[PDB]
Amino acid sequence: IINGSDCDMHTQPWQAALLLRPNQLYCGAVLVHPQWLLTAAHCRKKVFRVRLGHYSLSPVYESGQQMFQGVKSIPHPGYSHPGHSNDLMLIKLNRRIRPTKDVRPINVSSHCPSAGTKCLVSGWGTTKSPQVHFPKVLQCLNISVLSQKRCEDAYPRQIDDTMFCAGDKAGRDSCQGDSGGPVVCNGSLQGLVSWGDYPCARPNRPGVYTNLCKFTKWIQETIQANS
Numbered sequence: 001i002i003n004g005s006d007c008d009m010h011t012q013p014w015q016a017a018l019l020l021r022p023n024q025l026y027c028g029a030v031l032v033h034p035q036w037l038l039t040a041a042h043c044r045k046k047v048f049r050v051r052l053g054h055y056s057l058s059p060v061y062e063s064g065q066q067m068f069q070g071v072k073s074i075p076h077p078g079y080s081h082p083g084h085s086n087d088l089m090l091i092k093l094n095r096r097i098r099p100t101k102d103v104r105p106i107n108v109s110s111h112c113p114s115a116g117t118k119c120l121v122s123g124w125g126t127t128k129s130p131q132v133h134f135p136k137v138l139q140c141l142n143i144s145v146l147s148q149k150r151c152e153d154a155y156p157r158q159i160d161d162t163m164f165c166a167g168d169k170a171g172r173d174s175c176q177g178d179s180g181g182p183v184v185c186n187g188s189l190q191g192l193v194s195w196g197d198y199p200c201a202r203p204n205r206p207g208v209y210t211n212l213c214k215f216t217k218w219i220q221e222t223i224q225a226n227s
């Protein structure tokens, strides 16, 4: 997260981290069900761990923290290795989470984001670009959703309906390491960190996020089919 601020503790109990042995923090994720997480399809990994209810980046032990393993990864069928469309995947945990103030799922909005909507994006991604600089704790940033029209101009022929652009303010944007992270608007999960221009935070170059409002049915059906 570039030019963001330290998140307030205990807020965002749905924020998840996808770790790789030993403790390589790759991609973020979001708890959307007692036993299901949501992340970008391009974050698919065969072996990995899931850390929830943890504020800092380092494996520093914390109370309220919970660890799990990915027992099943289901990327949306429409996700194409080259294109950024349908950039979402479902991850099932080995067990149901223990509901606490630090670990709590969030609902997926059925209504798509309209221009001007203010959203909150978070992640342990680099706070600088192109120079790498990881934060100490979860970073938070407010971003406003742009009109699909403007989204299309900034990224011609590559912007799609399964995605949306967010972030007008200068120097503020998501970056590498935040992928799969949550974009919350109106108290619900509206998107996921997907992609953007490089280096991050370039003026008139908003970040692109998966438009979750288009997959509510698939998400519910997939969860029910694997319950």
Ligand SMILES: *[C@@H]1O[C@H](CO)[C@@H](O[C@@H]2O[C@H](CO)[C@@H](O)[C@H](O)[C@H]2NC(C)=O)[C@H](O)[C@H]1NC(C)=O
Residues within 6 Å of the ligand: 005, 120, 140, 141, 142
């Ligand atoms: C993101 O924007 C929201 C909306 O302005 C901020 O929420 C406010 O948070 C303060 C706490 O400092 C509350 O007193 C206000 O009531 C909140 N605003 C309202 C009316 O919802 C939030 O602080 C911002 N966070 C970041 C990271 O910028």
